[PDB]
């Protein structure tokens, strides 16, 4: 009734065959007693790195070990323990006089790739899914706390970005906004995972649009819209110039973190936001160097 290669066919299997399983490991593995072993045929110490797998040799087979009941916790190395720590990811200036946002408002493009510490950590993984907690610390350039009322507004991509302090966009009929005084403790808020993808990508090896990819448009290489969450806008809630110069530091704490595919950790200094460019004339070694290989 039906061709055999179609019946016995396996095209369509949606379940991923996994060769490994995640086991409970709340503490470091214990060490078991070991005695001398003088025999042929069994060679724990000999490996073959070509295979691409790490050595499975254990302490017990290399030396005579005692019994150690290891009760050291492995909890502080979970993804949440590692990433759930607020760090600086943005900094906005609202000076009185200058060429940088001198009209009492600013539009910060949401991108946590502007600061090395936070950036290097997250770039340890290729993909990451998480909720976050944003905290906004505001004050003057001297650290002085001033009696000023500010308005922070999240402008998702597509919404109208304010063009002035008195822009109509500040009506926030739908965008989420926060009104705080610099005298109040830093505003804090919870953000969900808002990407149209299943996770954010710190690395996107491709282009966002089709067509010819000429020199002028190489600016778009590695730009993934699934990571472009919109803009963060700030302003003096008023219609006149503020009496003080302001600064807003943005901190981010990740929660409910999932991460996939680890990568080599940043080796060279960061230069730009949208890419991994490095100074070709100042390529420094990963670490420290010495005089001779036979001397410390």
Partner 1 sequence: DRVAQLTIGNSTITTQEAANIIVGYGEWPSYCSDDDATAVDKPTRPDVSVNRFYTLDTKLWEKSSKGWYWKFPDVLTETGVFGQNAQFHYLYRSGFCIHVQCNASKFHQGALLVAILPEYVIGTVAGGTGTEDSHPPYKQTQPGADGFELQHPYVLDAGIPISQLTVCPHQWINLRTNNCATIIVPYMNTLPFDSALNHCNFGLLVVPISPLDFDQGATPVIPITITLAPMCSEFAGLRQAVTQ
Partner 2 sequence: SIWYQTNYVVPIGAPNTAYIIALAAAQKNFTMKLCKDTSHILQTASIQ
Partner 3 sequence: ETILEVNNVPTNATSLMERLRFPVSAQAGKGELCAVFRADPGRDGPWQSTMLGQLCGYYTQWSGSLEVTFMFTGSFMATGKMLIAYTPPGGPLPKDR
Ligand X SMILES: CCCCCCCCCCCCC/C=C\[C@H](O)[C@H](N)CO
CA–CA separation, 145 and 160 (whole Å):
31
CA–CA separation, 90 and 25 (whole Å):
37
23 binds partner 1 (CB under 8 A): no
Residues in the chain: 296
User: Which one of 11-19, 127-135, 245-253, 282-290 is the stretch in contact with Na ion (CB under 5 A)?
Assistant: 11-19
Q: Name the minimum Å distance from CB 71 to Na ion.
A: 6
Question: Chain-centre distance of CA 14, in angstroms?
Answer: 30
State phi, psi for 20 to the nearest 5 degrees. -125, 160
Structure tokens at 90: 């943005």
| CA neighbor of 119 nearest in space, from 5, 10, 200, 205 | 200
Of 83 and 202, nearer to ligand X (C-beta) is 202
Contacts of 11 (CB under 8 A, 6+ apart): none
158 binds partner 2 (CB under 8 A): yes
CA–CA separation, 234 and 99 (whole Å):
17
Please pick, from the candidates 111, 131, 133, 166, the single residue that binds ligand X as defined by CB under 6 A.
111
Say if CB 74 and CB 26 are below 8 A apart. Answer: yes
Please pick, from the candidates 74, 103, 164, 183, the single residue that binds Na ion as defined by CB under 5 A.
164
Partnered with residue 87 across adjacent β-strands are 252
Which of the residues 88 through 127 are near a second copy (CB under 8 A)? 88
* 132 burial via Cβ count (<10 Å: 0-12, 13-18, 19+): buried
Of 104 and 232, nearer to ligand X (C-beta) is 232
Please pick, from the candidates 12, 24, 158, 280, the single residue that binds partner 3 as defined by CB under 8 A.
158
Of 27 and 171, nearer to ligand X (C-beta) is 171
Please pick, from the candidates 95, 167, 226, 258, the single residue that binds partner 1 as defined by CB under 8 A.
226
Residue 77 interacts, among partner 2, a second copy, Na ion, none and using kind-specific CB cut-offs from 5 to 8 Å, with partner 2
Site residues (vs a second copy, CB under 8 A): 1-7, 11-15, 65-67, 85-88, 170-177
- Positions touching ligand X (CB under 6 A) are 110-113, 134, 152-154, 176-178, 189, 191, 200, 202, 227, 229, 232
The residue ranges that bind Na ion (CB under 5 A) are 14, 16, 27, 30, 55, 70, 163-164, 167
């Amino acid at each position: 009734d039906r061709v055999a290669d179609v019946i016995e066919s396996s095209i369509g299997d949606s379940v991923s065959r996994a060769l490994t399983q995640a086991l409970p490991a709340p503490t470091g593995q214990n060490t078991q007693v070991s005695s001398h072993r003088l025999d042929t045929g069994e060679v724990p110490a000999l490996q073959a790195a070509e295979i691409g797998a790490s050595s499975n040799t254990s302490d017990e087979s290399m030396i005579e070990t005692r019994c150690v009941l290891n009760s050291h916790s492995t909890a502080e190395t979970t993804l949440d323990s590692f990433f759930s720590r607020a760090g600086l990811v943005g900094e906005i200036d609202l000076p009185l006089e200058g060429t940088t946002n001198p009209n009492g408002y600013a539009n910060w493009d949401i991108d946590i790739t502007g600061y090395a510490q936070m950036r290097r950590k997250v770039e340890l993984f290729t993909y990451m899914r998480f909720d976050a907690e944003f905290t906004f610390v505001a004050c003057t350039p001297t650290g002085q706390v001033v009696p000023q009322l500010l308005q922070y507004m999240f402008v998702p991509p597509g919404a109208p970005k304010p063009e002035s302090r008195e822009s109509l966009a500040w009506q926030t009929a739908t965008n989420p906004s926060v009104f705080v005084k610099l005298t109040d403790p830093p505003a804090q808020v919870s953000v969900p995972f808002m990407s149209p993808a299943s996770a954010y990508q710190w690395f996107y090896d491709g282009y966002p649009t089709f067509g010819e990819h000429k020199q002028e448009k190489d600016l778009e290489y590695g730009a993934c819209p699934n990571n472009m969450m919109g803009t963060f806008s700030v302003r003096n809630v008023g219609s006149s110039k503020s009496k003080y110069p302001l600064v807003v530091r943005i901190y981010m704490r990740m929660k409910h973190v999932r991460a996939w595919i680890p990568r080599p950790m940043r080796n060279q200094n960061y230069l730009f936001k949208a890419n991994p460019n490095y100074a070709g004339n100042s390529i420094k070694p990963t670490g420290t160097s010495r005089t001779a290989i036979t001397t410390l």
